[PDB]
């Protein structure tokens, strides 16, 4: 009864101050303010266990739920986008259109969150495979996209690098031809000309490049595709031309 | 505490009860033997003892374990196979080397050899804490973490010792709580008593389906995930075919097998067969194992572990639904802890009920039901839960009328049947159209039409297809062949393949495990277009034969469709289908003519 | 003074006989936790005591007494309406306080207002098959009889979704005089069952004018058999204090049945046949008793419980005393259900107590009673002239049970089909069955009189 | 159904809003009298019951 007030109270005070350490949301903290003001001064439990009791202060668990669902949500969605930063003006108004919603529990918000948080715990313990550069590259792009471009518009750019990711989670260890041919294919069918420059380091896309142009070096039996197909691998960025012209030597 | 009475058969009488409770156990003697105090007559407590009582006597202590009857949760769950009791199973395994725990028994319920990475959470000194918060995390699985450190119920103050990151066991503590003095040590495991459920926020209605696989049993009546199923078992009929397939096939993030009265020959043959396959999750080192909670109690072992294997396994399912993941929870049966409990209350002496059960199997079968479901998170964290109440009701007594069955059956709003010939037949489950019911399935077509069903208009027409060939079965046979008319056979032939690609399978290949909801849905929208244009191209003129001839590849096509890939369009929806629903309308003209 | 005893959900208790009986006692443990009871047995130096809060864990000589000084009674105010509570009598969103300003024993009624005059105002529910079949009266307790696999939530709660729709227009008609309140009471029932009762509820629009009771398996059987009588207590109190129809549904029977057969093992009273207890009668006729017109002319006590099988047998003492206790009784067959009937209201063994006697003027015709008896009949040959044409056949059969073959056909599919949410009056139910029995001659109808008969076939 | 996610909070701005006049006569009302029944509670608990 009270412990769930004063555990969501402060809880709700520490996930606000470990969302935006800075404060500058004023406009996410303003609604916040009467369980703020309880955990900015000296207020034990037996003060919020009495003011709560006389209902001076919100003890309803559906509001509360309702309420912290939002904050848990926004600090899912601001911690998921790591180590990509958002704006303060982006998740104020992420978080004005969420609170706004009738449904923030069946809504596609948090089945993106854990698509992502999915992504991203498959990529933290993920093993000495291509697929997990690969993964790994476009899920910093699909969190550069969606940190840039906010959870709450559907571009199809974030929903293509969500289904590749999400397709490339789902391969087997018996399925690199798969990965690379779907990473291949994904890689030209965008309409960048890089889509990893000024996103990830260049060891991340040579070691792209020297995936790609070692997994097509052992098919080369000649001089002049040995020649062309060396030519290509003194590169540090990846691209569609390096791709394309790596497929015409092979 | 107390001193040893009398002896007189399997219970124990002490008397001396100066504060023992009846809700808290103890070990009689000084064989440590497992027991209760069920009831309390005076100065002498009456124990119910579940082990054998050879080498006791009258004048011995009855030392007290300090706590309720209850079962240790923390990280090591997975990966391990364990009673009802909390007996540590490898831990006989590794000493005794046995399957069956003997008398006497008196180690911990997790292993402490095992340690595991503790990180800090979001809470930080100065701040207030609460029962149902996330403190912190540890790993338990064999590649990655699952198991949330959060508070333990009846808690609550402030954060006097923060303790740092690093590996630590169980037995250590890691964080400690100061509310009025010096009011207990934490540690990362935690105890709660198996008669009282997990406390969470609230409670919400469950809209999500399970993602187990089964293209007829998503198709024809799809079982949510957070409801109460039933299933009448027959012991060999069917029931452990659809736990060891949904177990594998299945796709959640938990899983909690209960075995209360089983022979033994179905837990060794469901601990075995989970190392040795796979899952589709792209689960590596032992996925099918480390991702499962393996609880099996045999018919030999003592009823404390089958009577409690119940409640270890709602209060182990409560504690992963409050974590944030979701856990189906099977069980195999409700007969095993009825009759279980029906031994324990004639031989404890209670007075008994109708069928010979007791008088609060009712409520304890009420009660487990009811405690199952989807909710939230308790505390300010509010996560996404479900827990999926599957149990087998086999018979008791050798009747059908028994309040165990009839309960269940109305207590429960879907049913699963099973019969003896559909599993002979290759078919999982054994109920076509007459077997199976659901209540739950507008909510389901309302949330998987919500993501992108069309299964809301192809479901009664699913159905009707099954139940127009089943009902002119009966017309062939007893009115006649040549009764029938040209579309009774094309409604018969089509849902024959239906039943044959949809109800049919086995586990052939890796396409027929998991199965998803777009393959599913394009899979009844193809067959209901297959006998819309076979009624349609009937109708204007032509043959039976003439027109299962002119279709040919195109309805051919339709059984081997599940032998493709499930990737097919992007990496779920089946491209054949596609252009299968133009191919079928450009050989619907070619079928006519 | 300490715990002598406990055996299951009774504690006995060392505390002397000074208190009345029914008082409440609170148990003080070592253990932090505070259970409240009432003493259900009084004697000399040991008395008896059923907890509400907890169920195992009472220490022996570790617990301590306290008088509380107040008899076990439901507080019963006008402010309980909007607002979610237990079974207890404790809400669990944690707003405010009961707030009651009466006292109201739960054993037998405390005012006794019993009425002299039988109920004859029709009280309509949206039901062309409930209410065509059996005459409802205000305060005419009738329960719906099911079985295990039958969904009797789905009637209930469409009976209490278009239970306040019909009030508005039959106000005009001389059927009701006063508002209509609900009484919402779950014992043993799903969260999701609740939910769709109180999504039901708050369509309505009655969730603002009455009071909900969540009672779960999880919970003590004593503290979840006092709300049935809480909600008695509060619907009688509020019907009879208000001059309001109040209609009060308490499901499930079984749930209820099963926590007096649970609290009737560990005593010493004699069971009785079927496994369950031997003075179920005296239970039973404490919720049925409170059933009828109140005092003043203004104010009826209607209850519509709906009772489910325990065995699925016709054998049992709960179906046998409650459908005699009670004035009428809606039966539920599984074939009409599983045909695609909706609601699965079977009129083969359904009989009312009055049919004669229920229906007025202004509201009802009179020949709603020889129209209903005439379609039961017609419905029992029906049936019976369809087990013999389905068992011996069409042609072996007379020419005679043809007609009510046919008849029990199209009144199958035809009286009985409705939606969800539409509503049928009774001055329609009479026009539209008076088409269907429309089928065999002047000479076969003969439960009528020959007036109405002759002027409309 | 555009008018149903963002415009029943309207209702409820509205519901707290409108009720703003109503809690200040119960506790306008419920103080002035709050002297004698505080005499008549003490009394009562002074007293030997």
């Not at chain 1, 390096?242 to 497929?247: E, M």
């Not at chain 2, 194992?289 to 409690?308: G, I, Q, Y």
């Not at chain 3, 305060?139 to 939530?153: E, V």
Request: glycine share 8%; net charge negative; aromatic share 8%.
């Amino acid at each position: 009864y009270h412990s769930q007030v004063v555990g969501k109270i402060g809880y709700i005070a520490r996930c606000m101050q470990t969302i935006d350490p800075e404060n500058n949301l004023k406009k996410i903290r303003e609604d916040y303010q009467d369980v703020l003001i309880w955990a900015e001064k000296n207020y034990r439990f037996e003060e919020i266990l009495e003011a709560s009791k006389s209902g001076k202060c919100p003890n309803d668990l559906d509001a509360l739920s309702r309420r912290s669902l939002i904050l848990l949500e926004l600090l899912r969605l601001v911690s998921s986008i790591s180590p990509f930063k958002m704006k303060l003006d982006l998740i104020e108004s992420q978080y004005e259109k969420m609170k706004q919603h009738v449904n923030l529990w069946k809504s596609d918000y948090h089945v993106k969150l854990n698509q992502l948080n999915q992504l991203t715990d498959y990529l933290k313990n993920a093993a000495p495979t291509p697929k997990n550069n690969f993964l790994r590259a476009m899920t910093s792009v699909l969190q550069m996209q969606i940190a840039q471009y906010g959870i709450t518009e559907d571009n199809e750019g974030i929903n293509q690098l969500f289904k590749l990711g999400l397709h490339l989670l789902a391969m087997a260890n018996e399925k690199i031809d798969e990965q690379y041919h779907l990473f291949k294919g994904y890689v030209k069918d965008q309409p960048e000309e890089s889509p990893f420059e000024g996103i990830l380091p260049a060891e991340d896309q040579k070691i792209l490049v020297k995936t790609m142009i070692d997994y097509a070096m052992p098919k080369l039996s000649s001089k002049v595709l040995q020649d062309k197909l060396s030519a290509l691998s003194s590169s540090d960025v990846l691209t569609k031309t390096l791709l394309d012209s790596i497929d015409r030597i092979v | 505490y107390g001193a040893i009475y009398s002896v007189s058969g399997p219970v124990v009488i002490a008397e001396n009860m100066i504060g023992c409770a009846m809700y808290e156990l103890v070990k009689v003697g000084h064989d440590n033997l497992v027991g209760e105090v069920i009831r309390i007559d005076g100065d002498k407590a009456t124990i119910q003892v579940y082990e054998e009582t050879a080498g006791l006597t009258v004048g011995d202590p009855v030392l007290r374990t300090g706590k309720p009857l209850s079962v240790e949760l923390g990280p090591g769950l997975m990966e391990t196979i364990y009673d009802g009791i909390q007996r540590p199973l490898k831990a006989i395994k590794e000493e005794s080397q046995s399957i069956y725990i003997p008398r006497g028994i008196d180690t911990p319920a997790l292993d402490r050899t095992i340690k595991w990475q503790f990180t800090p959470g979001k809470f930080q000194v100065g701040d207030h804490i609460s029962g149902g918060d996330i403190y912190g995390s540890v790993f338990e699985n064999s590649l990655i973490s699952s198991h949330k450190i959060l508070l333990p119920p009846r808690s609550r103050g402030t954060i006097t010792w923060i303790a740092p990151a690093g590996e630590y066991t169980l037995d250590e503590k890691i964080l400690e709580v100061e509310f009025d003095g010096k009011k207990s040590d934490f540690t990362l495991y935690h105890t709660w008593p198996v008669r009282v459920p997990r406390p969470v926020t609230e409670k919400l209605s469950a809209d999500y389906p399970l993602l187990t696989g089964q293209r007829v049993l998503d198709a024809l009546f799809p079982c949510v995930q957070g409801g109460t199923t039933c299933i009448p078992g027959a012991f060999g009929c069917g029931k452990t075919v659809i736990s060891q397939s949904l177990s594998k096939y299945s796709n959640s993030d938990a899983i909690i097998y209960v075995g209360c009265g089983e022979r033994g020959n179905e837990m060794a043959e469901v601990l075995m067969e989970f190392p040795e396959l796979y899952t589709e999750m792209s689960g590596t080192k032992e996925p099918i194992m480390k991702r499962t909670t393996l609880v099996a109690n045999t018919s030999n072992m003592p009823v404390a572990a089958r009577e409690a294997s119940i409640y270890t396994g709602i209060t182990l399912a409560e504690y992963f639904r409050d974590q944030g993941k979701n856990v189906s929870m099977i069980a195999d049966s409700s007969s095993r802890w009825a009759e279980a409990l029906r031994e324990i209350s004639g031989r404890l002496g209670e007075m008994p009920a109708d069928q010979g059960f007791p008088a609060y199997l009712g409520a304890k079968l009420a009660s487990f039901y009811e405690r199952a479901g989807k909710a939230v998170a308790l505390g300010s964290p509010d996560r996404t839960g479900s827990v999926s109440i599957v149990a087998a009701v086999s018979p008791a007594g050798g009747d059908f009328s028994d309040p165990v069955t009839t309960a269940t059956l109305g207590i429960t709003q879907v049913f699963w049947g099973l019969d003896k010939k559909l599993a002979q037949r290759k078919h999982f489950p054994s109920i076509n159209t007459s077997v199976s019911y659901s209540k739950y399935t507008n909510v389901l077509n309302k949330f998987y039409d919500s993501n992108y069903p069309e299964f809301p208009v192809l479901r009664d027409r699913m159905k009707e297809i099954l139940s127009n060939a089943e009902e002119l079965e009966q017309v062939v046979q007893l009115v006649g062949k040549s009764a029938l008319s040209d579309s009774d056979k094309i409604t018969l032939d089509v849902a024959t393949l239906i039943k044959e690609d949809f109800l049919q399978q086995n586990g052939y290949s890796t396409y027929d495990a998991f199965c998803p909801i777009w393959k599913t849905f394009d899979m009844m929208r193809a067959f209901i277009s297959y006998h819309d244009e076979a009624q349609k191209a009937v109708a204007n003129g032509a043959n039976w034969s003439k027109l299962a001839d002119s279709t040919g590849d195109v309805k051919h096509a339709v059984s081997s469709s599940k032998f493709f890939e499930p990737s097919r369009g992007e990496k779920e929806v089946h491209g054949e289908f596609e252009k299968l629903l133009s191919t079928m309308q450009e050989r619907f003209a070619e079928s006519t003519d | 003074n300490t715990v002598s005893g406990v055996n299951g959900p009774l504690v006995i208790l060392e505390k002397v006989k000074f208190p009345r009986y029914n008082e409440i006692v609170n148990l003080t443990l070592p253990d932090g936790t505070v259970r409240q009871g009432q003493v259900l047995e009084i004697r000399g130096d040991r008395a008896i005591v059923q907890v509400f809060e907890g169920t195992s864990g009472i220490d022996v000589k570790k617990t301590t007494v306290e008088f509380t000084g107040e008899s076990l009674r439901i507080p019963v105010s006008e402010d309980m309406l909007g607002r979610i509570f237990d079974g207890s009598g404790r809400p669990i969103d944690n707003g405010p306080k009961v707030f009651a300003e009466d006292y109201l024993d739960i054993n037998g009624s405390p005012i006794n207002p019993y009425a002299r005059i039988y109920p004859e105002e029709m009280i309509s529910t949206g039901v062309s098959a409930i209410d065509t079949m059996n005459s409802i009266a205000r305060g005419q307790k009738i329960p719906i009889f099911s079985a295990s696999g039958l969904p009797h939530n789905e009637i209930a709660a469409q009976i209490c979704r278009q239970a306040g729709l019909v009030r508005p227009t039959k106000d005009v008609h001389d059927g009701h005089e006063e508002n209509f309140s609900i009484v919402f009471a779950a014992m043993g029932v799903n969260l999701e069952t609740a939910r769709f009762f109180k999504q039901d509820f708050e369509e309505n629009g009655s969730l603002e004018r009455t009071s909900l009771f969540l009672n779960l398996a999880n919970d003590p059987t004593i503290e979840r058999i006092i709300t049935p009588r809480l909600a008695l207590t509060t619907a009688e109190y509020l019907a009879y204090q208000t001059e309001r129809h109040v209609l009060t549904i308490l499901t499930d029977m079984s749930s209820y049945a099963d926590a007096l057969r649970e609290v009737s093992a560990a005593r010493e009273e004699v069971p009785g046949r079927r496994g369950y207890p031997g003075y179920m009668y005296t239970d039973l006729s404490t919720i049925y008793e409170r059933a009828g017109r109140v005092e003043g002319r203004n104010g009826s006590i209607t209850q519509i419980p709906i009772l489910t099988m325990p065995n699925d047998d016709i054998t049992h003492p709960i179906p046998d005393l409650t459908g005699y206790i009670t004035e009428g009784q809606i039966f539920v067959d599984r074939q009409l259900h599983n045909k695609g009937i909706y609601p699965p209201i079977n009129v083969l063994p359904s009989l009312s107590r009055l049919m004669k006697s229920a229906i007025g003027e202004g509201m009802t015709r009179k020949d709603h009673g020889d129209v209903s008896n005439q379609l039961y009949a017609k419905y029992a040959i029906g049936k019976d002239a369809a087990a013999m044409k389905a068992v011996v056949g069409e042609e072996a059969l007379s020419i005679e049970d043809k007609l009510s073959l046919e008849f029990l056909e199209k009144f199958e599919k035809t009286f009985i089909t409705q939606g969800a949410y539409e509503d049928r009056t009774v001055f329609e139910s009479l026009d539209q069955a008076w088409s269907l029995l429309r089928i065999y001659p002047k000479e076969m109808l003969n439960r009528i009189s020959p007036k109405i008969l002759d002027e409309f076939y | 159904e555009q008018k149903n996610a963002g415009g029943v909070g309207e209702l409820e701005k509205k519901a707290e809003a409108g009720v703003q006049g109503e809690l200040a006569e119960i506790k306008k009302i419920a103080e002035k009298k709050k002297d004698d029944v505080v005499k008549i509670l003490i009394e009562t608990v002074i007293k030997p019951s």
